[model samples]
Target: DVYAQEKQDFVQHFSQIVRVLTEDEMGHPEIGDAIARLKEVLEYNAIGGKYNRGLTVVVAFRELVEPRKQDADSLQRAWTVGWCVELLQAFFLVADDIMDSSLTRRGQICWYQKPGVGLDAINDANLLEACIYRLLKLYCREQPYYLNLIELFLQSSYQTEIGQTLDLLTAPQGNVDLVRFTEKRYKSIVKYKTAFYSFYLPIAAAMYMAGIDGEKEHANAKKILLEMGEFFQIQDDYLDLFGDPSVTGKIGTDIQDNKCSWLVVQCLQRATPEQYQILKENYGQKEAEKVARVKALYEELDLPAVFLQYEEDSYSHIMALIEQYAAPLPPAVFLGLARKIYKRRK
Candidate 1:
């Protein structure tokens, strides 16, 4: 859905952040140029995607906040806060690519892989972190919740890094380790890595800014958002196995990476010892037939059926939670946001 103008705006914002990062550069000199180019690549990549993450702020505001009756400035403030959500995502993604040893993002060649970039990508990722504060300061100033907003973003980052640590340590190279893929461990990884920041952080910030700062309200929001985040990750895992390269604009690499993905977890939970051995042998192999075999195995194990069940349960779970806790909050705001994200096809 990111059209030409959206792409242009992304480049503009991204380039500005890159320039600021260049002013405060870090890391090895050998890959300095490569790092800078990686910044460019990251900026471009951050633009399109689903935009659901960014829009969460706007929708949350519309639903939760009662802005001094017809105040345009307050509404504008909400929109700017939405922009911060997008900025925060860019921060995590740049760093995540380095941690994951990614070679490309959103279909473009990854910045680190380009000639001369190398490990300097770390510095670029750090720069992405800095950009979030830059935007926060640019907006949200003079608002009653300014300090709260800053603290929320900082706390979310710390929590996300901790989650990332767990994810990295749990399955460092995505090696087929059933021991590392427990439901409890999986919940921890998703809640910390993908849920808090991706789901709770944005809405929580909006809630604070909108004066819905009660602990009970925030807790309810967190509950709903975490469930949504889990569903989002489930879809991502499904896409890894079943998504089209042309439509997704990226080839699936979870199998090769030995990712502890949803499909693999389901297979581990359902497959026999013999089938598990088959997965261990072929899941990460370079052979084309091996990849196909793994896909076929997924079918046999009814991984798709597992996804369907999860999807159904997750949807009903979220809806029920929404009905229960969303009484104090704006249903339209959350519903609009949910409509944008829930049961999405892409």
Candidate 2:
């Protein structure tokens, strides 16, 4: 848990980037008012998350890199790297909001839904992407792992886009064809769309920066990270129906967004033909009753039990991989991450 003072410092430090972006956008008089209006929208969306994703870099680096306790220079660089991850999330959120037709994120209005913000939010998302490269050039240019980090970031983005495309095609509008729900398909979507960046990218970048370039080490690290990513996505899927929106800070929308969420796919995989028809009729319907019915079907299918089993199996898989393959990287990094995520309530 973040101490009060540390949390305050973290929020202030991270908000600086958004503040700069807002100021620059507002400088232009023609769109100034509109830009200013959307600032709060952007700010809340970007900052309101648990920050676990952003903090992963700092924590992972402490394990993968030398001199675990950060010096002034290293601390600045770590924060810069964390900023890039957060910026990448912003990039995804802007496009995701547009695609999902979402009105809010983290309980605040999504930027795209704000007046005069529609397609302009697309530019904002692109700007977020540009900011990643800008920060990379600014901070990591001279570092040994600089080029490698850039390549990894780009590769991860490409993979995520592929996953996004598959998601759009397969489950678009929550098409509940039982045939479309496959374990293989679900794994692919999670690995590409959710796992890579969330689990693999941040910590792996830190490892490279720390000068642990042996292929075996990175390979082991990938195993650990990707598994972590998979578990993380599964929890998110669980949270959609079971999680409290108040504590989670947002109502679940996967049911309406036609998402290929773990819960829905698992239900379809186990459902009978007639049950599948029921799902098709009510899966993506807007009525609360329909949504509730679909969720009830999930419960009947024993997905929660299956999810618990999957969690146990996934945890064991990561542990074995970490022990056998995790290079010379510090155990604390993987341990800290695992303890925090596995069995998490929200």
Candidate 3:
């Protein structure tokens, strides 16, 4: 609800997007059926989630572009790129859910979990990815930064996959290796997997559009944004276990998945040998009581208080980064996103 009108308008724009995939094929019957499923794939998979990444493009473009350049046509292109980011997210989530054997997404059953879909989600995920480039071609192909935008997205996906691979190798499914969940390992995974696409991609997309893609400027923005991104992921990890049950709604399988989560890593570092044994016995468990045992151990270890202090420290560190590097660009651009990071409930 941060940008209410734009959010609503972005959802409305999706209505016309499926037709963009089918505009030219007149005589192909099988293609028509394929297009129908493609529309269904997009309508279901891409429409959920908070739209935060998609809207980031609009927000960043507004901040970076001059008032005179902010016309209807330019803004429309910004919105399209925003949707491209969302599509990229949908692509990732669909595939990742398969890998995780995840049951749901954004409160609905996961795409791979659907009765009619099942393993069809594999190709569906691919189609969702293909949709991104098609949208880019239709809208930004003639733009000056077309290649930059394409390469930006391509690099984002590649880096995220590398991080995902690292995560899988470090914390393979069904294997709770607390020894591997170091602070350094956790940071690299989150920075590459969640931080780049979640935080850097959209603003950088806007930067390219706004002609601010100079290496120094991007490095500056990336430094601060990645800091903020790490903080965001840590908060998300805390919230997954400790969220106000009736308030902050999204839950995660970070614990059950045996993830290299910040909380688990910190809990590992701080626990006594006795406490460590309890964690090894109970962490990453799927049973109700086992999950509760880990949660209870976190309580005994004061991880909630630990997370609060870490939150404060992260904010101070990011503020320092902004002050140091956010010179030519308005600090408000970075500050606004940073501000939104803390105190988030949903």
Q: How far is candidate 2 from the true structure (C-alpha RMSD, Å)?
A: 3.1
Give the number of the best model, judged by lDDT: 3
For residues 1-346, could you state the per-residue lDDT of candidate 3 as single tens digits?
3455467877777776767766645667758778888888888888866787888788778888998999988988898899999999999989988877677677677889889889989999999899899989998999999999999999999998998998787766667688898999999988988899888998899999998879999998899988888888888789878976445433467778888888899898999999999989887767778888888998998999999898888889999999999978888777767766777765
Worst 10 residues of 1 by lDDT: 1-10
Task: Report the Cα RMSD per candidate.
Answer: 4.7, 3.1, 2.0
Cα RMSD, model 1: 4.7
Superposed model 1: Cα runs more than 4 Å off: 1-42, 67-72, 174-176, 284-289
Model 2 quality (TM-score): 0.87
Question: Cα deviation of 37 in candidate 3 (Å)?
Answer: 1.3
Alpha-carbon runs more than 4 Å astray in model 3: 24-29, 244-251
Which of the two, 2 or 3, has more TM-score?
3
TM-score for each of the candidates: 0.84, 0.87, 0.94
Error of 2 at 64 (Å): 3.1
Under the 3 Å rule for N, CA and C atoms, how many clashes does model 3 have? 0
TM-score, cand. 1 vs. native: 0.84
Clashes of each: 2, 1, 0
Model 2 per-residue lDDT at 25: 62
Quick one: ranking by lDDT, best first?
A: 3, 2, 1
